[PDB]
């Protein structure tokens with residue numbers, strides 16, 4: 001493909017971190033004097049074909065609020081996925097460490113608007129994220145937020161996919177039908193978006209504070225939901241609650257969610 005790059009085109013600068021399936025490095029694409037992010041493959045955590053398929057999916061993604069693929073190094077090991085660099089790291093650490101006078105209520109609305117826009121695009125393009133959380137959103141200059149998209153899957157909007165036998169999910173972000181039946185759809189991303197709103201509203205607090213993850217399912221089925229965070233506008237909390245409807249079909253679409261946040265963002269600025 002025209003996405004293939006020479007390994008020598010990039011010079012690594014610094015290791016940013018990395019966890020589950022690979023490390024992230026800050027690098028420089030010398031030919032364009034451009035700072036980039038390089039995703040490596042951690043052997044024994046993820047198979048080569050599963051990693052190459054992630055890159056194939058990213059090739060098709062083009063949105064201002066979705067991390068842009070720049071190139072890939074597949075020919076031989078180690079394999080790399082080269083994307084644009086997001087200067088301030090993940091949204092979780094950013095919210096926890098920020099100056100709340102600078103990152104005010106309007107900036108929070110701005111951030112939710114950008115995320116919902118990326119999700120509306122995935123919904124329109126027949127993609128599912130399956131890992132929406134603040135730690136998977138990246139921040140750039142002037143509160144620019146982009147959703148990381150390594151784990152995207154092709155799924156016709158409305159269809160439900162089933163995860164593999166004995167799959168582990170981050171319980172507190174996972175929709176009840178996904179916890180109980182390993183069923184994932186755009187509606188399960190709507191549920192996770194609800195949790196992401198709560199992380200934004202609390203400036204990076206951990207959801208279901210103090211609650212045992214093994215008791216979350218039973219609580220959700222008995223209609224327990226996180227309460228309205230301090231300072232959260234009731235309209236924004238009504239949206240979280242609409243995202244947390246037990247029935248997937250009762251949850252709003254990302255087009256409706258995006259429209260609601262766009263209106264509130266325009267109004268708050270005015």
Ligand SMILES: CC(C)[C@H](CO)Nc1nc(Nc2ccc(C(=O)O)c(Cl)c2)c2ncn(C(C)C)c2n1
Pocket residue numbers: 016017018019023024037038039067083084085086087088089090135138148149
């Ligand atoms: C923990 C690592 C892996 C990080 C945060 O989630 N991932 C991570 N961090 C990024 N950039 C930064 C920016 C600043 C810092 C800093 O502290 O100075 C750090 Cl750690 C990373 C990044 N940019 C594009 N990507 C794509 C690959 C989407 C990134 N993934």
